[PDB]
């Protein structure tokens, strides 16, 4: 199925944070309104934060995460969790290789902020 796409409440601030666990340099692209809204890049094998930023959900609430390593799109897994009907986590893992640890770039989106 389509992965890494999440519908957020409109005009809502959310945080997006990316970690790396791979030999390769990860390029995390965050699209709000089908237009690019933030880009994280970095390399780590120790869960290093390669980016963190607060964005606004925009008119449509459509937020998309895309991961590529060396210009090759990683395979994505994703899901959304809601705790006490109020605290939202949009979760993405990605695989750039063959071991299928899906942690090569990990992306968390959380809202609401404040
Ligand atoms: C250190 C390795 O880097 C990548 C590929 C090469 O090797 C990742 O896909 C692996 O999961 C692992 O983190
Ligand atoms: Ca991997
Ligand atoms: Ca890995």
From TrEMBL:
Protein name as annotated: Fucose-binding lectin
Calcium-mediated lectin domain sequence ranges: 6-113
Signal peptide as annotated in the record: none
SUPFAM superfamilies in alphabetical order: Calcium-mediated lectin (SSF82026)
One of the Pfam families matching this protein, by short name: PA-IIL
Higher taxonomy: Bacteria, Pseudomonadati, Pseudomonadota, Gammaproteobacteria, Pseudomonadales
Protein keywords: Lectin
Source organism of the structure: Pseudomonas aeruginosa
GO MF: carbohydrate binding
């Amino acid at each position: 199925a389509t992965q890494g796409v999440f519908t957020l409440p409109a005009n809502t601030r959310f945080g997006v944070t990316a970690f790396a666990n791979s030999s390769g340099t990860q390029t995390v692209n965050v699209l709000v309104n089908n237009e690019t809204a933030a880009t994280f890049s970095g390399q780590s094998t120790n869960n290093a934060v390669i980016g963190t930023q607060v964005l606004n959900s925009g008119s449509s609430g459509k937020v998309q995460v895309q991961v590529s390593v060396n210009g090759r799109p990683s395979d994505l897994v994703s899901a959304q969790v809601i705790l006490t009907n109020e605290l939202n986590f949009a979760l993405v893992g990605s695989e750039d290789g063959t071991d299928n640890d899906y942690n090569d770039a990990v992306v968390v989106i959380n809202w609401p902020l404040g």
